[PDB]
């Protein structure tokens, strides 16, 4: 199937701190595999999945020294943005970046990414053409014009089409699954009128999933209640969805679970 690499980077200023904190987290197929954190006693990129310890010392030294460079890049950029928005001293400020590549199931490049947010809102992104930039704010046009003038997008296009794909292939080989949800229905005597049925899905991976209750053939948002999918903490995720249905008409309500590891969706009813 398809594959991806992403690094999610954060630079954070707060009114007390001397200089910002820089954190870089790399993902392969949406699973964290390296992490740099300037707050560590000896800041360095570190493996976060056992299959990455295959990389020898000079990989880590090289990547660590790059991260110290990006840390200074973020420091200057945060200082510049402060002025672009006429923000005074004494606040908390955040720069965030996501970058990486998506690969088809043929392992060829689908799309490259390079996006930034300031204060948690879109600041500037490289367009899918990998040649032009989009920037919403009037303040961000200053950055776009700087980056257009220096031809910066050319280096980024080269990364996204070259090293990003090439190193993702290396990683895919060195770390060369899914867990289907287990579902059950719980019964919750609620009021005189009716009961709630709670359709649980447990132990699944990845987190993308969908639960639906149908009264004998009709999906309903009629006060169907759910929770956001949540990590169990062991690598797998959880979700439930609940609905109220008159007593004695329980097995007229039936829950469906959609997850990509399933041979087909699960249909299930309440079981005493």
């Amino acid at each position: 199937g398809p594959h991806s690499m992403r690094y999610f980077e954060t630079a954070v200023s707060r009114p007390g701190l001397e200089e910002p904190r820089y954190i870089s987290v790399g993902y392969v197929d949406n699973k964290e595999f390296v992490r740099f954190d300037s707050d560590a006693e000896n800041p360095r990129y570190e493996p976060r999945a056992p299959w990455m310890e295959q990389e020898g010392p000079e990989y880590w030294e090289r990547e660590t020294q790059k991260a110290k460079g990006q840390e200074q890049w973020f420091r200057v950029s945060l200082r510049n943005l402060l002025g672009y928005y006429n923000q005074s001293a004494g606040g908390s400020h955040t720069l965030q970046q996501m970058s990486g590549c998506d690969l088809g199931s043929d392992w060829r490049l689908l799309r490259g990414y390079l996006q930034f947010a300031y204060e948690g809102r879109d600041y500037i992104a490289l367009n899918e053409d990998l040649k032009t930039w989009t920037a919403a704010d009037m303040a961000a046009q200053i950055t776009r014009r700087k980056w257009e003038q220096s031809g910066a997008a050319e280096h980024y296009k080269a990364y996204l089409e070259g090293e990003c794909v090439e190193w993702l292939h290396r990683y895919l080989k060195n770390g060369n699954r899914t867990d289907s949800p287990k579902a059950h229905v719980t019964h919750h005597p609620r009021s005189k009128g009716e009961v709630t049925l709670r359709c649980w899905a447990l132990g699944f991976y990845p987190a993308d999933i969908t639960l639906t209750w149908q009264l004998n053939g009709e999906e309903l948002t009629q006060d169907m209640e759910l929770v956001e999918t949540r990590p169990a903490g062991d690598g797998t995720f959880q979700k439930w969805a609940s609905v109220v249905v008159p007593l004695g008409k329980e097995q007229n309500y039936t829950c469906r679970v959609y997850h990509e590891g399933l041979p087909e969706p699960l249909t299930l009813r309440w079981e005493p």
Partner: peptide, 9 residues
């Protein structure tokens, strides 16, 4: 391997 930004914002 992470992207290397060049020019500052």
């Amino acid at each position: 391997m992470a992207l290397r930004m060049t020019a500052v914002m």
